[model samples]
Target: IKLDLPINFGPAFEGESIRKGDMYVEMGGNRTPAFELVRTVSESEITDGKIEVIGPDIDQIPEGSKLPLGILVDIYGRKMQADFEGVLERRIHDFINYGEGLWHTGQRNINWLRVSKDAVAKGFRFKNYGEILVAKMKEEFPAIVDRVQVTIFTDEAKVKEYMEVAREKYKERDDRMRGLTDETVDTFYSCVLCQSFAPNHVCIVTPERVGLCGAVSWLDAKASYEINHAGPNQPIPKEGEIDPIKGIWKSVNDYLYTASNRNLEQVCLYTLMENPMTSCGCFEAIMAILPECNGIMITTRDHAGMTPSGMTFSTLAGMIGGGTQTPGFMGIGRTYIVSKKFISADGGIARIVWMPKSLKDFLHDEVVRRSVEEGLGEDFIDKIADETIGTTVDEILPYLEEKGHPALTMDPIMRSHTSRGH
Candidate 1:
């Protein structure tokens, strides 16, 4: 496979994040409109291995330029289905990131990519994107994807035009995904991709809950299973219900015992106060119970500040993330914050007393919307405390009390020692 590139595609550069100062050129990072979509097109509609750049190439663009870029990938195969669209689309991140000097992050419209000066000097071209994606897709999922066509667009007008269509398609996909629930689906998928590092960790992915990594979704796992039945994403039938309020299920417990190699015995699908799911250290956020505050403090991995729980995000992550079933701590994806099943047994989103200001603002609209849906009023988000208000349990206590936060008025989260017959 005489590939023309300066760097080897080994473990050396894999999983490395490219920062701004070290980048030669950047695309999208919120400076310009950008999106990437992978759609299943008919066999006659695609030219196998065809790659097209609708506008300027990397050489034509100036260094450190942030431009409107869109990557449109079309795949065709006998076994291809609509369910495979997002699964294949997500591979764009992995494929682009595999390049020696290229780094990619985010997905959908907010997609960001960077190329290093070293990579540019080593004869890397934007056109090489097609070669990388084609080779990788063929190599990875050859059973369902035998052909691929990729178009890298830099034209502002075209990117703007296609981004709208891509967003609409994404909304449709999300709508379908949101419709899936634990009650609606008889089976859920478990992700063990991180087991090599966290041997006892197993991520149970459902329609309402994503993997702790915040990357793999239920559909992604389903598609992965279709591609490789014996792969890590295995199906667990929703066979028996143990406790609905705490989200404890018999089937999940059985699977956890086996999947975690008997390290984990029980897990709650919804609650953080009791036998919550194990984390693989890649979760986007941490949810920790604040006993003194009678609520929970949520923080994202991006946040570097302290929370009312008296711990930084990293501290909380380290405490419970390594496949440990910490009863009072849990790792979660940001999107799961909007889920109806999100910590329901522990008073749901209303129980979130403090979070980083940036994370609070980042999820402002969605939090407000979910709060309203949960009958907590649309203004409920304003009641939550962020770093701007306080960072300690004592500092935030007054704020939470002043706002008449629901957690303060809710039933006691902690049980008496006598309740356990101690």
Candidate 2:
């Protein structure tokens, strides 16, 4: 895959982050509607190597402006299945990040994309995205990726319209994933993709948990295994359950020990207190313990605001990331926040006392259902404090009390029973 473009490209530029001052334009990530959808289609529906941009190009947009972006990639492969859609889509992260001054995170609709001023001044365009994606898909996944077509949408109306289509498919995918939980199967998937940079990082993906990147789901990881057999995705047999409450398993810990180069001996899938999973800096959200609130607070990549935990998203991300376990704090896919298995070890969904309002709105319906099922009633979602209310536990304490948040009255979160040797 050769990219003869204005800017440098490759893994050498992958870890680079373009700060706000260097940003040329920002897209999606709660600021506007933006999504990337990769769907399988017949050869007739897609032309190989064809790319189109339906709205204003990068140079056309003013600097420091937010715009809606919808990327629809149509693929034709003799061996492709609907299940492999997400598998292929996750690669977009790596492919796009290969470009200098470009950064992206999250998937589906909540994507946060940025282009750098340097790249633009050097002549990077929206068309470059198509070039990077098309070449990478064909070169790397030749076995399963044949004819690939790319379409970029900057027009807000078109994005919103097609976002509905993507959301519908996402819902169907989620529904398909519902009945499959950690208990339903004896095999779990291992994702070590971000290991490209962090040698010690390993993602032991479970049906109840999405990878910290908010992109690869259990089915996605499974399909990725099928596509790239000897690649980053591997399957680990759940030899036995060590601690079901904290979601510790014999094979999981065994795999973690070896896969992490023996630096990490264990990890708990559903618990954040002890031996939690490592973060490779791709998390859509960061969860930090809030002892005074008797619960936890999660801030998203889309939210650049303060939280009741006395920290911003990046501050907590800096504390817990880089292939190490930070007990009582962890990175998670925003989608996992509503899962029944979310932090089920210490408590259930009620343990979440704070979240960004944008995330709350995106997950409102599911949060309501989970709250009701957990005996918290529908009002529980309203009780959750957000950035508008306060940014420190002291500032939000009165608001939580007025709202009668259940987490406030829950058992002490720092109790000895949260240990693993039980």
Best by TM-score: 2
**CA shift at 264, candidate 2, in angstroms?**
1.1
Per-residue alpha-carbon lDDT of candidate 1 for residues 119-215, written as tens digits (9 for 90 to 100): 8888888778878887887877878887888899989999989998798878777776867887888889888876755789999898889777655
TM-score of each: 0.83, 0.96
Worst 10 residues of 2 by lDDT: 413-422
- Candidate 1 has what TM-score? 0.83
- Residue-pair clashes per prediction, in order, are 0, 0
Off by over 4 Å in 1: 1-3, 18-21, 25-34, 53-69, 110-121, 154-159, 196-199, 301-322, 356-366, 387-396, 412-422
User: Which residue pairs does candidate 2 place in steric collision?
Assistant: none
In candidate 2, what are the lDDT values of residues 1-422, reduced to their tens digit? 56577898988988889888999999987788899999999988788888899889897888988889998888899988899888888888888898999998888888889999999989899998998889988887889987899999998789979999899888878887978988888889988899876879999888988898978888889988988888898999998788888888888888888888897888888888888888897889988888878888889976888787777888888888899777788888988998888989878788888888888998999999998898998999989988788877887789899999999999888672244343
lDDT top scorer = 2
